[PDB]
Amino acid sequence: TSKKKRQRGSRTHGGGSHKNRRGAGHRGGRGDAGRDKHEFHNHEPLGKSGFKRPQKVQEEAATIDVREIDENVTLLAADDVAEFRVDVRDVVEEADDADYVKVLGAGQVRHELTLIADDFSEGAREKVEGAGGSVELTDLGEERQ
Amino acid sequence: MQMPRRFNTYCPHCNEHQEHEVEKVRSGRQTGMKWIDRQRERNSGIGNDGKFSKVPGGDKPTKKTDLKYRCGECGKAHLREGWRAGRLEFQE
Amino acid sequence: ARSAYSYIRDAWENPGDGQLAELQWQRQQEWRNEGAVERIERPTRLDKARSQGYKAKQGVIVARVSVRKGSARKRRHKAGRRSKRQGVTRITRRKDIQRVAEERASRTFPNLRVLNSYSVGQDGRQKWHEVILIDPNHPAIQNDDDLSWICADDQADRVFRGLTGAGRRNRGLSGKGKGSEKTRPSLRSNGGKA
RNA sequence: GGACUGUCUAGUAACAACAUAGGUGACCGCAAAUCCGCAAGGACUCGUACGGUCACUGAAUCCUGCCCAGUGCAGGUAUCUG
RNA sequence: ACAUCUCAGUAUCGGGAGGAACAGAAAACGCAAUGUGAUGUCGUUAGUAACCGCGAGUGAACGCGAUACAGCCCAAACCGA
Ligand SMILES: [Cl-]
Ligand SMILES: [Cl-]
Ligand SMILES: [Cl-]
Ligand SMILES: [Cl-]
Ligand SMILES: [K+]
Ligand SMILES: [Mg+2]
Ligand SMILES: [Mg+2]
Ligand SMILES: [Mg+2]
Ligand SMILES: [Mg+2]
Ligand SMILES: [Mg+2]
Ligand SMILES: [Mg+2]
Ligand SMILES: [Mg+2]
Ligand SMILES: [Mg+2]
Ligand SMILES: [Mg+2]
Ligand SMILES: [Mg+2]
Ligand SMILES: [Mg+2]
Ligand SMILES: [Mg+2]
Ligand code: NA
Ligand code: NA
Ligand code: NA
Ligand code: NA
Ligand code: NA
Ligand code: NA
Ligand code: NA
Ligand code: NA
Ligand code: NA
Ligand code: NA
Ligand code: NA
Ligand code: NA
Ligand code: NA
């Protein structure tokens, strides 16, 4: 039995005095009315902030953390088993409509990996060379200067 | 109140105390080419023109100090918080 | 070599210069004394006519139509209106003078259909255009592989529905890309927003 | 009290209210002044200053003083503003 | 409260076509490309970009997945009844 189904006989259906549930006055105005006066509480302040750049000048990067790669190496049997080597561009999902692929250094690297990507970070590098591994920058990756 | 035209104080640019010269900020002219100037033309037409139909506000009994502190050596200026003053006159 | 037609065209690039200038000064005097719709035997600008569809044939008609210059002839509000809608003077109509002339002509010839039109000048208070009309019932046209299409039922009263050339342009259908989001495939379908 | 005959709140007001002749000022020579229309056009007007428009006062009799600073209208205007 | 805004290009008014109308073979797009390739419409893009007493509110498109697919004729040049 629902709350609704128990209202017959209550007269007010939970509204308190029958002088309550009338029009927009019981709401303090239609929609967002009074967002700076009587109902300013818990409303983001009035104002203009910052600027936007034209969408066709914006770039969307494809990210991936080392932890993800390293945790699935033994399962990624369909990828080169060097002295491990994996072209990152083939691992990441959503790599089609992306401007490039970048490897981030989050997590551990318990293997000797030879990574191929368009861009890396310090932590990504240090952790790969920390496990006696290399990092190979792609031709697109040659855009660093 | 009176105020010395030149005195020693911290220059946030050199990062060491130096002699600054005090001047009153003059109003820079309007180019009339900012976004607000364009919206006035676009949005104004037949009948009332919203905000662009309003007229100048009013006046406070006393305005704060609008000054420019210029460093004697590096020559750059910095701004400071003002204080209500009925009149300001520099000494020398 | 240049066609003889290319010369009529060139003179009309500058209706204020040369002989055409003197010609226009003379003509308009007789024009101002004529009606609103005057059927004429030969087009004033041969090159433009033929370019638009004209043909020296049975069932092809032409008519000069004068319309007044200026904005809308509107009556001031008689009941309550917010300031935005109390205008009279700066209000103009959304249909252009050339499209107005085309209509006043098609009504004079209730059996014919508008093919196209062009401008033939104006003075200080009126504009003249020459509409080209076609008899959809004459067999000379019904067998013309160039003009027969204007015989179909769906071409009936084509001017009043904006299917004319000047019509389609005034409806903002020129551009095929940017700026034509609310105009194509029709103004009415896009909630009337252009 | 209103000069008089006259008009009015169909349905709580018939009056001292409105009208009136009479007095006064204003605008206009007619392609006018005043007014109607979005326009095409129209009333006044088959009229022309002894006219007709726009107002005030309100028969007759005796009269109708002073003020142009403010507001209004109108004319002029070196110079200022525009 | 209210004047821009909103209700809405809605109600209502004038004119007109059909069995469907309108649109339509780029002076296009601009995931900028070594790329797409007429038009409607459906799903999505997205309440995103953009508007706005920058208040309340308002509000696309390119692309994509589908449906269905189809491209052609003049004016002129050169001929001249
Ligand atoms: Cl941005
Ligand atoms: Cl100051
Ligand atoms: Cl027609
Ligand atoms: Cl594309
Ligand atoms: K309103
Ligand atoms: Mg205005
Ligand atoms: Mg449609
Ligand atoms: Mg009486
Ligand atoms: Mg009574
Ligand atoms: Mg009585
Ligand atoms: Mg009685
Ligand atoms: Mg009386
Ligand atoms: Mg009198
Ligand atoms: Mg009199
Ligand atoms: Mg809207
Ligand atoms: Mg408000
Ligand atoms: Mg686009
Ligand atoms: Na409750
Ligand atoms: Na109630
Ligand atoms: Na509320
Ligand atoms: Na407030
Ligand atoms: Na894509
Ligand atoms: Na605009
Ligand atoms: Na017709
Ligand atoms: Na528009
Ligand atoms: Na009597
Ligand atoms: Na006075
Ligand atoms: Na005076
Ligand atoms: Na109110
Ligand atoms: Na607004």
JSON list of N, CA and C in Angstrom, two decimals, chain C residues 36-89:
[
{"chain": "C", "resi": 36, "resn": "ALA", "atom": "N", "xyz": [-1.52, 50.44, -63.91]},
{"chain": "C", "resi": 36, "resn": "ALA", "atom": "CA", "xyz": [-0.76, 49.70, -62.91]},
{"chain": "C", "resi": 36, "resn": "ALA", "atom": "C", "xyz": [-0.20, 48.44, -63.59]},
{"chain": "C", "resi": 37, "resn": "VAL", "atom": "N", "xyz": [-0.96, 47.92, -64.54]},
{"chain": "C", "resi": 37, "resn": "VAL", "atom": "CA", "xyz": [-0.56, 46.74, -65.30]},
{"chain": "C", "resi": 37, "resn": "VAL", "atom": "C", "xyz": [-0.82, 47.01, -66.78]},
{"chain": "C", "resi": 38, "resn": "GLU", "atom": "N", "xyz": [0.24, 47.19, -67.55]},
{"chain": "C", "resi": 38, "resn": "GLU", "atom": "CA", "xyz": [0.12, 47.45, -68.99]},
{"chain": "C", "resi": 38, "resn": "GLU", "atom": "C", "xyz": [0.79, 46.38, -69.83]},
{"chain": "C", "resi": 39, "resn": "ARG", "atom": "N", "xyz": [-0.01, 45.60, -70.57]},
{"chain": "C", "resi": 39, "resn": "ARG", "atom": "CA", "xyz": [0.55, 44.57, -71.43]},
{"chain": "C", "resi": 39, "resn": "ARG", "atom": "C", "xyz": [1.35, 45.25, -72.56]},
{"chain": "C", "resi": 40, "resn": "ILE", "atom": "N", "xyz": [2.58, 44.78, -72.78]},
{"chain": "C", "resi": 40, "resn": "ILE", "atom": "CA", "xyz": [3.44, 45.35, -73.81]},
{"chain": "C", "resi": 40, "resn": "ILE", "atom": "C", "xyz": [3.93, 44.29, -74.81]},
{"chain": "C", "resi": 41, "resn": "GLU", "atom": "N", "xyz": [3.94, 44.65, -76.09]},
{"chain": "C", "resi": 41, "resn": "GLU", "atom": "CA", "xyz": [4.36, 43.74, -77.15]},
{"chain": "C", "resi": 41, "resn": "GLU", "atom": "C", "xyz": [5.79, 43.22, -77.11]},
{"chain": "C", "resi": 42, "resn": "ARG", "atom": "N", "xyz": [6.73, 44.09, -76.76]},
{"chain": "C", "resi": 42, "resn": "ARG", "atom": "CA", "xyz": [8.13, 43.69, -76.67]},
{"chain": "C", "resi": 42, "resn": "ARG", "atom": "C", "xyz": [8.81, 44.13, -75.36]},
{"chain": "C", "resi": 43, "resn": "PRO", "atom": "N", "xyz": [9.61, 43.24, -74.75]},
{"chain": "C", "resi": 43, "resn": "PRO", "atom": "CA", "xyz": [10.34, 43.47, -73.50]},
{"chain": "C", "resi": 43, "resn": "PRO", "atom": "C", "xyz": [11.30, 44.65, -73.63]},
{"chain": "C", "resi": 44, "resn": "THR", "atom": "N", "xyz": [11.42, 45.47, -72.59]},
{"chain": "C", "resi": 44, "resn": "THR", "atom": "CA", "xyz": [12.32, 46.61, -72.63]},
{"chain": "C", "resi": 44, "resn": "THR", "atom": "C", "xyz": [13.80, 46.21, -72.59]},
{"chain": "C", "resi": 45, "resn": "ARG", "atom": "N", "xyz": [14.07, 45.03, -72.02]},
{"chain": "C", "resi": 45, "resn": "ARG", "atom": "CA", "xyz": [15.43, 44.51, -71.88]},
{"chain": "C", "resi": 45, "resn": "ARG", "atom": "C", "xyz": [15.47, 43.08, -72.41]},
{"chain": "C", "resi": 46, "resn": "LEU", "atom": "N", "xyz": [15.62, 42.95, -73.72]},
{"chain": "C", "resi": 46, "resn": "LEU", "atom": "CA", "xyz": [15.64, 41.65, -74.38]},
{"chain": "C", "resi": 46, "resn": "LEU", "atom": "C", "xyz": [16.55, 40.60, -73.74]},
{"chain": "C", "resi": 47, "resn": "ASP", "atom": "N", "xyz": [17.81, 40.97, -73.49]},
{"chain": "C", "resi": 47, "resn": "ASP", "atom": "CA", "xyz": [18.79, 40.06, -72.89]},
{"chain": "C", "resi": 47, "resn": "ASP", "atom": "C", "xyz": [18.35, 39.43, -71.56]},
{"chain": "C", "resi": 48, "resn": "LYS", "atom": "N", "xyz": [17.80, 40.26, -70.67]},
{"chain": "C", "resi": 48, "resn": "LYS", "atom": "CA", "xyz": [17.35, 39.80, -69.37]},
{"chain": "C", "resi": 48, "resn": "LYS", "atom": "C", "xyz": [16.15, 38.86, -69.48]},
{"chain": "C", "resi": 49, "resn": "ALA", "atom": "N", "xyz": [15.23, 39.20, -70.38]},
{"chain": "C", "resi": 49, "resn": "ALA", "atom": "CA", "xyz": [14.03, 38.42, -70.60]},
{"chain": "C", "resi": 49, "resn": "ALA", "atom": "C", "xyz": [14.40, 37.02, -71.05]},
{"chain": "C", "resi": 50, "resn": "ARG", "atom": "N", "xyz": [15.07, 36.93, -72.19]},
{"chain": "C", "resi": 50, "resn": "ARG", "atom": "CA", "xyz": [15.50, 35.66, -72.76]},
{"chain": "C", "resi": 50, "resn": "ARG", "atom": "C", "xyz": [16.30, 34.84, -71.75]},
{"chain": "C", "resi": 51, "resn": "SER", "atom": "N", "xyz": [17.13, 35.54, -70.97]},
{"chain": "C", "resi": 51, "resn": "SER", "atom": "CA", "xyz": [17.96, 34.91, -69.95]},
{"chain": "C", "resi": 51, "resn": "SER", "atom": "C", "xyz": [17.07, 34.24, -68.91]},
{"chain": "C", "resi": 52, "resn": "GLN", "atom": "N", "xyz": [15.94, 34.87, -68.62]},
{"chain": "C", "resi": 52, "resn": "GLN", "atom": "CA", "xyz": [14.99, 34.35, -67.64]},
{"chain": "C", "resi": 52, "resn": "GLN", "atom": "C", "xyz": [14.00, 33.30, -68.15]},
{"chain": "C", "resi": 53, "resn": "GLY", "atom": "N", "xyz": [13.80, 33.24, -69.47]},
{"chain": "C", "resi": 53, "resn": "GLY", "atom": "CA", "xyz": [12.89, 32.24, -70.02]},
{"chain": "C", "resi": 53, "resn": "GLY", "atom": "C", "xyz": [12.10, 32.69, -71.24]},
{"chain": "C", "resi": 54, "resn": "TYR", "atom": "N", "xyz": [12.05, 34.00, -71.45]},
{"chain": "C", "resi": 54, "resn": "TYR", "atom": "CA", "xyz": [11.33, 34.58, -72.57]},
{"chain": "C", "resi": 54, "resn": "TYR", "atom": "C", "xyz": [11.60, 33.95, -73.95]},
{"chain": "C", "resi": 55, "resn": "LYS", "atom": "N", "xyz": [10.55, 33.93, -74.77]},
{"chain": "C", "resi": 55, "resn": "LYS", "atom": "CA", "xyz": [10.58, 33.39, -76.12]},
{"chain": "C", "resi": 55, "resn": "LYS", "atom": "C", "xyz": [9.56, 34.13, -77.00]},
{"chain": "C", "resi": 56, "resn": "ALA", "atom": "N", "xyz": [9.98, 34.53, -78.20]},
{"chain": "C", "resi": 56, "resn": "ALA", "atom": "CA", "xyz": [9.09, 35.20, -79.15]},
{"chain": "C", "resi": 56, "resn": "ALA", "atom": "C", "xyz": [8.18, 34.10, -79.69]},
{"chain": "C", "resi": 57, "resn": "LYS", "atom": "N", "xyz": [7.07, 33.86, -78.99]},
{"chain": "C", "resi": 57, "resn": "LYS", "atom": "CA", "xyz": [6.15, 32.79, -79.33]},
{"chain": "C", "resi": 57, "resn": "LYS", "atom": "C", "xyz": [4.71, 33.06, -78.86]},
{"chain": "C", "resi": 58, "resn": "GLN", "atom": "N", "xyz": [3.77, 32.26, -79.37]},
{"chain": "C", "resi": 58, "resn": "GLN", "atom": "CA", "xyz": [2.36, 32.38, -79.00]},
{"chain": "C", "resi": 58, "resn": "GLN", "atom": "C", "xyz": [2.17, 31.88, -77.58]},
{"chain": "C", "resi": 59, "resn": "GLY", "atom": "N", "xyz": [1.53, 32.69, -76.73]},
{"chain": "C", "resi": 59, "resn": "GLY", "atom": "CA", "xyz": [1.29, 32.28, -75.36]},
{"chain": "C", "resi": 59, "resn": "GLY", "atom": "C", "xyz": [2.30, 32.83, -74.36]},
{"chain": "C", "resi": 60, "resn": "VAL", "atom": "N", "xyz": [3.20, 33.68, -74.83]},
{"chain": "C", "resi": 60, "resn": "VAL", "atom": "CA", "xyz": [4.21, 34.29, -73.97]},
{"chain": "C", "resi": 60, "resn": "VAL", "atom": "C", "xyz": [3.83, 35.76, -73.86]},
{"chain": "C", "resi": 61, "resn": "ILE", "atom": "N", "xyz": [3.56, 36.21, -72.65]},
{"chain": "C", "resi": 61, "resn": "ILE", "atom": "CA", "xyz": [3.14, 37.59, -72.43]},
{"chain": "C", "resi": 61, "resn": "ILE", "atom": "C", "xyz": [4.07, 38.37, -71.49]},
{"chain": "C", "resi": 62, "resn": "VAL", "atom": "N", "xyz": [4.05, 39.69, -71.62]},
{"chain": "C", "resi": 62, "resn": "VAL", "atom": "CA", "xyz": [4.85, 40.59, -70.80]},
{"chain": "C", "resi": 62, "resn": "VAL", "atom": "C", "xyz": [3.97, 41.77, -70.37]},
{"chain": "C", "resi": 63, "resn": "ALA", "atom": "N", "xyz": [4.22, 42.31, -69.17]},
{"chain": "C", "resi": 63, "resn": "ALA", "atom": "CA", "xyz": [3.44, 43.44, -68.64]},
{"chain": "C", "resi": 63, "resn": "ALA", "atom": "C", "xyz": [4.23, 44.28, -67.64]},
{"chain": "C", "resi": 64, "resn": "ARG", "atom": "N", "xyz": [4.24, 45.60, -67.85]},
{"chain": "C", "resi": 64, "resn": "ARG", "atom": "CA", "xyz": [4.95, 46.50, -66.95]},
{"chain": "C", "resi": 64, "resn": "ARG", "atom": "C", "xyz": [4.04, 46.82, -65.78]},
{"chain": "C", "resi": 65, "resn": "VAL", "atom": "N", "xyz": [4.56, 46.71, -64.56]},
{"chain": "C", "resi": 65, "resn": "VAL", "atom": "CA", "xyz": [3.78, 46.97, -63.35]},
{"chain": "C", "resi": 65, "resn": "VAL", "atom": "C", "xyz": [4.43, 47.97, -62.40]},
{"chain": "C", "resi": 66, "resn": "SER", "atom": "N", "xyz": [3.74, 49.06, -62.11]},
{"chain": "C", "resi": 66, "resn": "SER", "atom": "CA", "xyz": [4.28, 50.05, -61.17]},
{"chain": "C", "resi": 66, "resn": "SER", "atom": "C", "xyz": [3.71, 49.89, -59.76]},
{"chain": "C", "resi": 67, "resn": "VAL", "atom": "N", "xyz": [4.61, 49.99, -58.79]},
{"chain": "C", "resi": 67, "resn": "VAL", "atom": "CA", "xyz": [4.29, 49.89, -57.37]},
{"chain": "C", "resi": 67, "resn": "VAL", "atom": "C", "xyz": [4.96, 51.08, -56.68]},
{"chain": "C", "resi": 68, "resn": "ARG", "atom": "N", "xyz": [4.33, 51.56, -55.62]},
{"chain": "C", "resi": 68, "resn": "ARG", "atom": "CA", "xyz": [4.82, 52.69, -54.85]},
{"chain": "C", "resi": 68, "resn": "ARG", "atom": "C", "xyz": [6.11, 52.38, -54.09]},
{"chain": "C", "resi": 69, "resn": "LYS", "atom": "N", "xyz": [6.98, 53.37, -53.97]},
{"chain": "C", "resi": 69, "resn": "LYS", "atom": "CA", "xyz": [8.23, 53.19, -53.25]},
{"chain": "C", "resi": 69, "resn": "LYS", "atom": "C", "xyz": [8.05, 53.38, -51.74]},
{"chain": "C", "resi": 70, "resn": "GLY", "atom": "N", "xyz": [8.95, 52.76, -50.96]},
{"chain": "C", "resi": 70, "resn": "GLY", "atom": "CA", "xyz": [8.89, 52.89, -49.51]},
{"chain": "C", "resi": 70, "resn": "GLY", "atom": "C", "xyz": [8.49, 51.71, -48.64]},
{"chain": "C", "resi": 71, "resn": "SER", "atom": "N", "xyz": [8.36, 52.02, -47.35]},
{"chain": "C", "resi": 71, "resn": "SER", "atom": "CA", "xyz": [7.99, 51.06, -46.31]},
{"chain": "C", "resi": 71, "resn": "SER", "atom": "C", "xyz": [6.50, 50.77, -46.29]},
{"chain": "C", "resi": 72, "resn": "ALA", "atom": "N", "xyz": [6.08, 50.05, -45.26]},
{"chain": "C", "resi": 72, "resn": "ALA", "atom": "CA", "xyz": [4.68, 49.65, -45.08]},
{"chain": "C", "resi": 72, "resn": "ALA", "atom": "C", "xyz": [3.71, 50.80, -44.86]},
{"chain": "C", "resi": 73, "resn": "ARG", "atom": "N", "xyz": [2.51, 50.62, -45.41]},
{"chain": "C", "resi": 73, "resn": "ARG", "atom": "CA", "xyz": [1.42, 51.59, -45.28]},
{"chain": "C", "resi": 73, "resn": "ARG", "atom": "C", "xyz": [0.57, 51.03, -44.14]},
{"chain": "C", "resi": 74, "resn": "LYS", "atom": "N", "xyz": [1.09, 51.12, -42.92]},
{"chain": "C", "resi": 74, "resn": "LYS", "atom": "CA", "xyz": [0.40, 50.57, -41.76]},
{"chain": "C", "resi": 74, "resn": "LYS", "atom": "C", "xyz": [-0.44, 51.54, -40.95]},
{"chain": "C", "resi": 75, "resn": "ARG", "atom": "N", "xyz": [-1.52, 51.02, -40.39]},
{"chain": "C", "resi": 75, "resn": "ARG", "atom": "CA", "xyz": [-2.43, 51.79, -39.53]},
{"chain": "C", "resi": 75, "resn": "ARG", "atom": "C", "xyz": [-1.94, 51.64, -38.09]},
{"chain": "C", "resi": 76, "resn": "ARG", "atom": "N", "xyz": [-2.01, 52.73, -37.33]},
{"chain": "C", "resi": 76, "resn": "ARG", "atom": "CA", "xyz": [-1.57, 52.72, -35.93]},
{"chain": "C", "resi": 76, "resn": "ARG", "atom": "C", "xyz": [-2.52, 51.88, -35.08]},
{"chain": "C", "resi": 77, "resn": "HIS", "atom": "N", "xyz": [-1.96, 51.22, -34.06]},
{"chain": "C", "resi": 77, "resn": "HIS", "atom": "CA", "xyz": [-2.71, 50.36, -33.13]},
{"chain": "C", "resi": 77, "resn": "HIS", "atom": "C", "xyz": [-3.93, 51.09, -32.54]},
{"chain": "C", "resi": 78, "resn": "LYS", "atom": "N", "xyz": [-5.04, 50.38, -32.39]},
{"chain": "C", "resi": 78, "resn": "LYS", "atom": "CA", "xyz": [-6.26, 50.99, -31.85]},
{"chain": "C", "resi": 78, "resn": "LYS", "atom": "C", "xyz": [-6.61, 50.51, -30.45]},
{"chain": "C", "resi": 79, "resn": "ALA", "atom": "N", "xyz": [-5.88, 49.52, -29.97]},
{"chain": "C", "resi": 79, "resn": "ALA", "atom": "CA", "xyz": [-6.10, 48.96, -28.65]},
{"chain": "C", "resi": 79, "resn": "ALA", "atom": "C", "xyz": [-4.75, 48.82, -27.93]},
{"chain": "C", "resi": 80, "resn": "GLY", "atom": "N", "xyz": [-4.76, 48.18, -26.77]},
{"chain": "C", "resi": 80, "resn": "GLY", "atom": "CA", "xyz": [-3.56, 47.99, -25.97]},
{"chain": "C", "resi": 80, "resn": "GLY", "atom": "C", "xyz": [-2.39, 47.32, -26.67]},
{"chain": "C", "resi": 81, "resn": "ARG", "atom": "N", "xyz": [-1.20, 47.92, -26.50]},
{"chain": "C", "resi": 81, "resn": "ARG", "atom": "CA", "xyz": [0.03, 47.43, -27.10]},
{"chain": "C", "resi": 81, "resn": "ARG", "atom": "C", "xyz": [1.22, 47.83, -26.22]},
{"chain": "C", "resi": 82, "resn": "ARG", "atom": "N", "xyz": [2.18, 46.93, -26.07]},
{"chain": "C", "resi": 82, "resn": "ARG", "atom": "CA", "xyz": [3.38, 47.25, -25.31]},
{"chain": "C", "resi": 82, "resn": "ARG", "atom": "C", "xyz": [4.25, 48.08, -26.27]},
{"chain": "C", "resi": 83, "resn": "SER", "atom": "N", "xyz": [5.09, 48.97, -25.73]},
{"chain": "C", "resi": 83, "resn": "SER", "atom": "CA", "xyz": [5.91, 49.86, -26.55]},
{"chain": "C", "resi": 83, "resn": "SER", "atom": "C", "xyz": [6.56, 49.25, -27.79]},
{"chain": "C", "resi": 84, "resn": "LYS", "atom": "N", "xyz": [6.97, 47.99, -27.70]},
{"chain": "C", "resi": 84, "resn": "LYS", "atom": "CA", "xyz": [7.61, 47.29, -28.81]},
{"chain": "C", "resi": 84, "resn": "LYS", "atom": "C", "xyz": [6.74, 47.18, -30.05]},
{"chain": "C", "resi": 85, "resn": "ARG", "atom": "N", "xyz": [5.42, 47.11, -29.85]},
{"chain": "C", "resi": 85, "resn": "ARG", "atom": "CA", "xyz": [4.45, 46.95, -30.93]},
{"chain": "C", "resi": 85, "resn": "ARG", "atom": "C", "xyz": [3.61, 48.19, -31.27]},
{"chain": "C", "resi": 86, "resn": "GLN", "atom": "N", "xyz": [4.08, 49.37, -30.89]},
{"chain": "C", "resi": 86, "resn": "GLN", "atom": "CA", "xyz": [3.35, 50.60, -31.16]},
{"chain": "C", "resi": 86, "resn": "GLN", "atom": "C", "xyz": [3.90, 51.34, -32.37]},
{"chain": "C", "resi": 87, "resn": "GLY", "atom": "N", "xyz": [4.83, 50.69, -33.07]},
{"chain": "C", "resi": 87, "resn": "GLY", "atom": "CA", "xyz": [5.43, 51.29, -34.24]},
{"chain": "C", "resi": 87, "resn": "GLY", "atom": "C", "xyz": [4.54, 51.35, -35.47]},
{"chain": "C", "resi": 88, "resn": "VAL", "atom": "N", "xyz": [4.83, 52.35, -36.29]},
{"chain": "C", "resi": 88, "resn": "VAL", "atom": "CA", "xyz": [4.10, 52.58, -37.53]},
{"chain": "C", "resi": 88, "resn": "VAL", "atom": "C", "xyz": [5.09, 52.91, -38.64]},
{"chain": "C", "resi": 89, "resn": "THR", "atom": "N", "xyz": [5.87, 53.96, -38.40]},
{"chain": "C", "resi": 89, "resn": "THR", "atom": "CA", "xyz": [6.84, 54.51, -39.34]},
{"chain": "C", "resi": 89, "resn": "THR", "atom": "C", "xyz": [8.02, 53.66, -39.85]}
]
